[PDB]
Design a protein around this ligand. Structure first.
Ligand SMILES: Nc1ncnc2c1ncn2[C@@H]1O[C@H](CSCC[C@H](N)C(=O)O)[C@@H](O)[C@H]1O
Ligand SMILES: CNCCOP(=O)(O)O
Length: 429
């Protein structure tokens, strides 16, 4: 039971990709006439619009700059052969670089990983076109906000995808989902770190970090970059009354965050799947940007920092904790760990240099490695002590990997290879 706010959000999603352009040809697949007309009225005279009410009518659409598909796939999401026909027809109808905005409510789909599985399905599909393939490049998955605020529904999704040419090479997103942040990896991490957290020290430590923002007020807006399974965002909202928007590139991670907020219900918290280095955030809109033990994953720190600066309100504050590299002689074992994780580590000097260049003022940096060491020791006595309860849930292979990993990090700290760094700063004015 949606409202016109939904169609406006669908068009905003389109403009994340096409920016100031008005699309010349738009197709709309939407079986409900009122929603379809609401979408049509969003466009002006520079746009020609074609609409249909069933997917087989997509055969009549071509050369589209954008295809908006709204609540049309109830059958397809339960039937791969029908879904394949749709993806095929969608790809044929779009120009190369054309944008698909797909809205589908998954709240009546009991399977909680459905959003993630659909995203992977779209990302993998290939169609022969000419002497190569075409397929969809991933941009984002957003929640329909009307559904959160009016219907307590966090599982109403909008995919933003773009048609691209492909050869006949694993993505960053797929690397995260297939290696470090598999479902079993995620839940094994949560077990050691603490409920809802994938970061050192769990709830108590995250609260201590949040306090280093200084005074925060109810209703202020926070962007959480690399929100994981949501514990930090949920805590910022529940403890300080912040409105928190969390983003993560991993669908495995966000599937958990989304399942949990949909069940528990807190309208202060919303989530999006996207790459925080690419995604179009509203400029000058956030009071705070928080990133907890995420950015060691991100190579282009300069780009990230400029994007953070852009998204902050003047006077707003950024606070980040991250794995970093120390000043000791690097061991081959640490280097293999770094290479296998694909971490792009920096030291505090480097972070401060980048923050100054970006234009941040009031820069604070801290080497929190001694606290990191305490946390690793406490965490390890816990896995070692609760071995029997762990083995009831996960494999022996998973268990030994946690024990050996924590042992290893302790030695990496000892050589001053592995550091745990803090950075905060403010946008001028
Ligand atoms: N470029 C990027 N954009 C968005 N998220 C990213 C990212 N690079 C890494 N990540 C995410 O950063 C997360 C790090 S795990 C820590 C999660 C959470 N902040 C916590 O405190 O519990 C991972 O889920 C990973 O997917
Ligand atoms: C977010 N940090 C998660 C743990 O990563 P690891 O310490 O296993 O390299």
């Amino acid at each position: 039971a949606s409202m016109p706010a939904v169609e406006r959000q669908l068009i905003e999603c389109l403009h994340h990709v096409i920016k100031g352009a008005e699309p010349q040809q738009v197709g709309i697949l939407c079986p409900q006439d009122d929603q379809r007309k609401a979408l049509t009225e969003q466009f002006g005279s520079k746009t020609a619009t074609s609409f249909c009410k069933e997917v087989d009518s997509l055969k009549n659409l071509s050369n589209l700059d954008a295809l908006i598909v709204n609540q049309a796939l109830d059958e397809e999401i339960n039937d791969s052969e029908k879904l394949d026909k749709f993806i095929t027809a969608a790809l044929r109808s779009l120009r190369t670089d054309g944008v698909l905005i797909l809205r589908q409510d998954l709240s009546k789909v009991k399977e909680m990983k459905k959003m993630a599985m659909l995203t992977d399905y779209f990302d993998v599909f290939r169609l022969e076109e000419g002497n190569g393939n075409v397929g969809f490049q991933f941009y984002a998955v957003n929640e329909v906000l009307d559904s959160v605020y009016v219907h307590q529904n966090w599982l109403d999704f909008i995919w933003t995808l773009m048609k691209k040419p492909f050869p006949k090479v694993v993505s960053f997103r797929d690397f995260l989902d297939r290696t470090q942040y598999t479902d079993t990896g995620i839940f094994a991490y949560e077990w050691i770190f603490g409920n809802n957290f994938i970061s050192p020290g769990g709830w108590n430590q995250n609260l201590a970090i949040l306090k280093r923002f200084g005074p925060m007020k109810t209703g202020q807006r926070m962007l959480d970059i690399g929100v994981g399974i949501g514990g930090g965002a949920r805590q910022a909202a529940s403890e300080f009354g912040l409105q928190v928007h969390g983003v993560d590139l991993s669908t495995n991670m966000l599937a958990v965050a989304l399942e949990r907020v949909h069940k528990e219900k807190d309208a202060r918290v919303t989530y999006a799947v996207c790459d925080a280095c690419e995604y179009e955030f509203e400029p000058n809109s956030f009071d705070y940007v928080f990133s907890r033990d995420c950015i060691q994953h991100i190579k282009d720190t300069d780009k990230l920092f400029s994007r953070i600066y852009r998204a902050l309100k003047p006077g707003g504050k950024v606070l980040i904790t991250m794995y970093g590299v120390g000043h000791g002689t690097l061991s081959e074992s640490f280097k293999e760990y770094v290479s296998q994780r694909q971490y792009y580590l920096k030291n505090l000097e480097q972070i401060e240099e980048i923050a100054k260049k970006t234009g941040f003022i009031d820069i604070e940096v801290e080497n929190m490695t001694p606290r990191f060491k305490e946390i690793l020791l406490e965490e390890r006595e816990r896995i070692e002590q609760d071995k029997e309860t762990f083995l009831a849930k996960f494999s022996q292979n998973a268990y030994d990997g946690l024990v050996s990993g924590w042992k290893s990090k302790l030695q990496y700290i000892a050589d001053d290879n592995h550091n745990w760094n803090f950075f905060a700063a403010v946008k001028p004015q």
